Amino acid sequence: GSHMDKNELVQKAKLAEQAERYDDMAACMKSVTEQGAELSNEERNLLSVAYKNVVGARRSSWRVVSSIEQKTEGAEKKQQMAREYREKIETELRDICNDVLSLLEKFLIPNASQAESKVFYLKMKGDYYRYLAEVAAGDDKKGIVDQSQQAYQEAFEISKKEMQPTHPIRLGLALNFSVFYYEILNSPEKACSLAKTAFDEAIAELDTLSEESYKDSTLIMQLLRDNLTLWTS
Amino acid sequence: GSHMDKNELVQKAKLAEQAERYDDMAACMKSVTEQGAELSNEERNLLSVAYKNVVGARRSSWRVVSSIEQKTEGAEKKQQMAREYREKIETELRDICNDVLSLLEKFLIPNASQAESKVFYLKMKGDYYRYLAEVAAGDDKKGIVDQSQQAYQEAFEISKKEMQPTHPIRLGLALNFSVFYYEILNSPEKACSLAKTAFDEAIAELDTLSEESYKDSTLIMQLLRDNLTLWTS
Ligand SMILES: *Nc1nc(C)c(O)c(C=O)c1COP(=O)(O)O
Ligand SMILES: *Nc1nc(C)c(O)c(C=O)c1COP(=O)(O)O
Ligand code: NI
Ligand code: NI
């Protein structure tokens, strides 16, 4: 009401980024978001990046430890040691995902004015439930995986009607929705199906591309391409 | 005495490294050092690697924020935000160096038999006091600097009486020692002379490089020349 300076938070969030201190950066944007004000494209970018870094570092640590755990199964204490370290990391992963999901469902998504940013948050929602999914105990895994799917799906509809096939975010949605299908629902089928499509529909309008993102669209289109054959191969 | 196994901590430390969680890694190696045993060659590497990464990130952020704390000034408001963020980072930085300095002065240096490690720890000592010197205030800055120089100085002796001009640790000692004179005591004079002399003495016996550390010896020499080069203008 007078206790928060939403503008200084953004500067500080921007300062934490330069300093490569993303936990701090994420802490500032979470706080900017809770002020209830619909985010500007720069702020949305600052939020996405911060949390991308914060959650991403853990997802990468998890994988490394998730491996060492297996490839060191023979022994007990050792493997057993790696298992606890992994659980320590999953607790961190969850706290991060519950927070982004909470901001996403209570502040961002409901106040998305434009369709472009609505799809973007819906996509984030899909990504973060997916992160919870990758580390959920079989019992809760079903419900979670479903949260992800329906979030991506809802973003996929909105995009398939308000956004051009070449728009970076729509393409980005297809990129991760397709990954969700290959890595989560372990369905190389539905996967490839979506990644190839979204790619053609982009090509069909390669001229609809703009210098405003011709470098971004194709960039993601290369990732869609790379993954695509990476699976067929 | 039965509450913590040194070997399991080391494995904990290596696991953390693989997952690139250096703070966890440093905490493990700190525990290993406190176990009271002179460190092995592997354990020493794990310690310096971990702390180099932990303090490195802070020094790095300290600079990014300090430099931005300047490009401001005119904005007393933003300047305060920057300044406080700098102090926060300083407190972290200062805590890390304090711990390392404590480990070195209490457990490591005192129980360093082989003249190699002793020089390595004595050097680490000069380095960490140097890090403190960079963020110290005029008041106590002198004494701190006085601590950096003394630690390097004695390390410089033992080396130039036990290590060849080509041994990596001796070369490294000369590099940071020369970086201290230039960056800290502000005098490229004694800085270049020390760097250039550590280099000339290297090549003099150039064909003394062992396949085991020629690349290592080489990397230190390039830096010595590059730094020296930059000090030549
Ligand atoms: N989702 C997404 N959107 C945009 C605009 C991109 O350029 C890219 C890739 O560069 C992606 C895929 O993003 P990640 O969530 O995997 O970082
Ligand atoms: N001091 C030092 N020693 C050794 C054995 C090295 O290989 C290197 C460089 O890789 C150095 C310089 O180390 P920093 O204190 O700048 O990380
Ligand atoms: Ni207020
Ligand atoms: Ni014990």
> Contact A172/A220 with Cβ under 8 angstroms?
yes
- Axis-axis angle for helices B6-18, B41-70 (nearest 10): 50
The answer to whether the CB atoms of A20 and B64 lie below 8 A apart is: yes
Amino acid at A114: Q
Those residues whose C-beta lies under 8 Å from the C-beta of residue A151, and which sit 6 or more positions away, are A122, A123, A125, A126, A129
CATH of the domain at A182: 1.20.190.20
Instruction: Tell me the best of B51, B53, B123, B220 to mutate to test the pocket of ligand 2, counting ligand atoms within 8 Å of each CB and taking the most.
Output: B220
**What is the phi-psi region of residue B117: left when phi exceeds 0, alpha when psi lies from -120 to 50, beta otherwise?**
alpha
Q: Can you tell me the distance from the alpha carbon of B161 to that of B165, in angstroms, rounded to the nearest whole number? A: 10
Written as six digits, the tokens of B75 are: 């904005």
Q: Can you tell me the distance from the alpha carbon of B29 to that of B31, in angstroms, rounded to the nearest whole number? A: 5
Percentages helix, strand, coil for chain A (3-state, rounded to 5) are 80, 0, 20
Technique of determination = X-ray
Q: Long-range contacts made by residues B149-153, C-beta under 8 angstroms, separation at least 24?
A: B149/B180, B149/B185, B150/B126, B151/B122, B151/B123, B151/B125, B151/B126, B152/B122, B152/B123, B152/B125, B152/B126, B152/B176, B152/B177, B152/B180, B153/B126
Smallest Cα–Cα separation from A14: which of B63, B76, B65? B65
Q: Can you tell me the distance from the alpha carbon of B77 to that of B134, in angstroms, rounded to the nearest whole number? A: 25
> Contact B135/B94 with Cβ under 8 angstroms?
yes
* Ligand 2: centre distance to CA B124 (Å): 10
Q: Can you tell me the distance from the alpha carbon of A28 to that of A34, in angstroms, rounded to the nearest whole number? A: 10
Nearest to A64 among B12, B18, B60 (CB): B18
Number of domain units in chain A: 1
Written as six digits, the tokens of B53 are: 């990464």
Written as six digits, the tokens of A1 are: 């009401």
> Contact B170/B122 with Cβ under 8 angstroms?
no
List the helix and strand counts (H, then E) for chain B: 9, 0
Q: Which 8-state DSSP code applies to residue B19? A: T
Buried b (16+ CB within 10 A) or exposed e, B149-173: bebbebbbebbbeebbbbbbbbbbb
Is A232 exposed, middle or buried, given 0-12, 13-18 or 19+ CB atoms closer than 10 A? exposed
> Contact B43/B29 with Cβ under 8 angstroms?
yes
Q: Resolution of the coordinates in A? A: 2.4
| CA quadruple B211, B216, B217, B219: dihedral sign | positive
- In chain B, what's the furthest Cα-to-Cα distance? 59
For A101-128, give the DSSP string. HHHIIIIIGGG--SHHHHHHHHHHHHHH
> Contact B228/B192 with Cβ under 8 angstroms?
yes
* Ligand 1: centre distance to CA A134 (Å): 19
CA A137 from chain centre, in angstroms, equals: 21
> Contact A46/A14 with Cβ under 8 angstroms?
yes
Q: Can you tell me the distance from the alpha carbon of A81 to that of A94, in angstroms, rounded to the nearest whole number? A: 20
Nearest to B15 among A12, A20, A68 (CB): A68
Optimal mutation site among B15, B25, B77, B93, interface A, most CBs of chain A within 10 A: B15
Q: Can you tell me the distance from the alpha carbon of A232 to that of A227, in angstroms, rounded to the nearest whole number? A: 9
> Contact B108/B121 with Cβ under 8 angstroms?
yes
Q: Can you tell me the distance from the alpha carbon of B63 to that of B86, in angstroms, rounded to the nearest whole number? A: 9
Domain extent for A153: 1-233
